[PDB]
Each structure stands twice: as structure tokens, then as C-alpha cells.
């Protein structure tokens, strides 16, 4: 197989697509979601290669810019309005651009994760979305009064586990929350650390909202 970077810098991110193949299963991705697959300060972008039906891969790593709006947070491909955020990201990773890793594998999220959490002393709490079970870990650590973690677990056809935790361990430090998401969407595994520049505690609505956008996005790639 041969790689090509024949596409221009995007204006919207939707002007071209690239076709990928996971052992026969195709995914067609608007090229603005592929900022890591570029050359020369994001002036040459990955393109379908003549004579090759698809890029045969084991994983795809898309990159999305996340942005606050009046209607929530939204995810964007590279475009002329947000490009400076991607340029910073490509230099040192230090901007509001998240990576989402897509593979094609059988789901291995536990259908009994919540039961396990209960056995560990993590407690169930009310959920804003009935299809998610919510849990809060407030277990006591004498040396770490800041220990605090949340889980939001979805089952169904496309299960997901969202973990949101305070990374602060001392008193001079500030609160610094981070998030992990593991999920299975339409036969794919989709794993990511969203909101990478946010240190503030995020609500269930912010976290589930992001994941709903990711589910729609990944599904749009196999609608083609
Ligand atoms: Na690659």
C-alpha cells in the first residue's frame, strides 16, 4: 500500500473524504477529521491514493476541536475558523483538540461493571439519562482527601463507560478533572480522552453530550 497527501488545506473539512478498510469493513471520513495525517504545517492532507481502493489499517485516530456554544459543546473538524487550535495541537498537543481512536473489534466492556463497582464501595447515584447508570466513588483515603471519581455506564447495542476523576492530590494543587471514555459503536471500539484542556469538574450532561456527538460522528462514517 501507498500513502498520498494530495489534498489541500481544508476550508470546512468536508471537501474531501478518505476511505479506510478494517479487514473488509469500510469507513469514509471527511478529511478535516484527520489532522494528524498531514505534512508541512497542515498544508498537505491525506488523500485517497490512485489505484488503491482504501487504506488498510488496524486503527484510525481522528482529531476533533471541541468548542463551547449556547447550545452546549460541539465537535469540529479542521476549518478556517478553528485552524489555529489545530496548528498549536500539531506543535505540542496543548490545545482543545481531542483524539479519538477507532478500531474494529468485538466489544469487551463488562456488562456487569456496575455490580463490580458496588462490590468495591463505589455508590450508585441518580442519572440525568435513564440509559446511563451513574456512580460516585467517595471512598476514604486518609492521605488524599481529594479522591473523587464518577462513572457513567450505558449498556444496549452500543455500550459506553465514561470515567471522570479529580487528579488533585495535595493542597497547594488546584482541582484538575480529567475524563476517559471507552465505548463500542456498531462493531467498532471507540476510545478517547475528551475535554483534554478542561480542569473544571464537568456535568453528566456535558460528558454524555460529548459521547452522543461521538456516536453520531462515528456512525456518519459508515453511512459513508
Ligand atoms: Na498512520
Numbering used by the authors: 44 to 267
Give the authors' words.
The FrpD43-271 protein (FrpD), a construct lacking the first 42 residues encompassing the N-terminal signal peptide (residues 1–24) and the linker sequence (residues 24–43), has been previously characterized. The protein crystallized in two alternative crystal forms, belonging to the hexagonal space group P64 and the orthorhombic space group P212121, both accommodating a single molecule in the asymmetric unit. Experimental phases were obtained from single-wavelength anomalous dispersion (SAD) of crystals of selenomethionine-labelled FrpD protein (SeMet FrpD) grown in the orthorhombic space group. The structure of the SeMet FrpD protein was refined to 1.4 Å resolution with an R value of 16.8% (Rfree of 19.3%). Here, we determined the crystal structure of the FrpD43-271 at 1.4 Å resolution. The refined crystallographic models of FrpD comprise 224 of the 229 residues, with one N-terminal and four C-terminal residues being disordered. Both FrpD structures are largely identical, with a coordinate root-mean-square deviation (rmsd) of 0.56 Å over the 224 aligned residues. The structure is characterized by a C-terminal α-helix (α3) that traverses a series of antiparallel β-strands. A single disulphide bond in a right-handed spiral conformation is present between the Cys150 and Cys227 residues. The electrostatic surface potential map revealed that the FrpD surface is highly negatively charged, except for a single positively charged region located at the β9 and β10 strands of the structure.
FrpD is a highly conserved lipoprotein located in the outer membrane of all meningococcal strains, and it does not exhibit similarity to known protein sequences from other organisms. Intriguingly, the FrpC1-414 fragment exhibits a very high affinity (KD ~ 0.2 nM) for FrpD, the other protein expressed from the iron-regulated frpDC operon. FrpD displays a compact, slightly concave bean-shaped structure and consists of fourteen β strands (β1–β14), one 310 helix (η1), two short α helices (α1, α2), and one long C-terminal helix α3. Hence, the similarity of FrpD fold topology to other proteins was not sufficient for establishment of structural homology, indicating that FrpD possesses a novel fold.
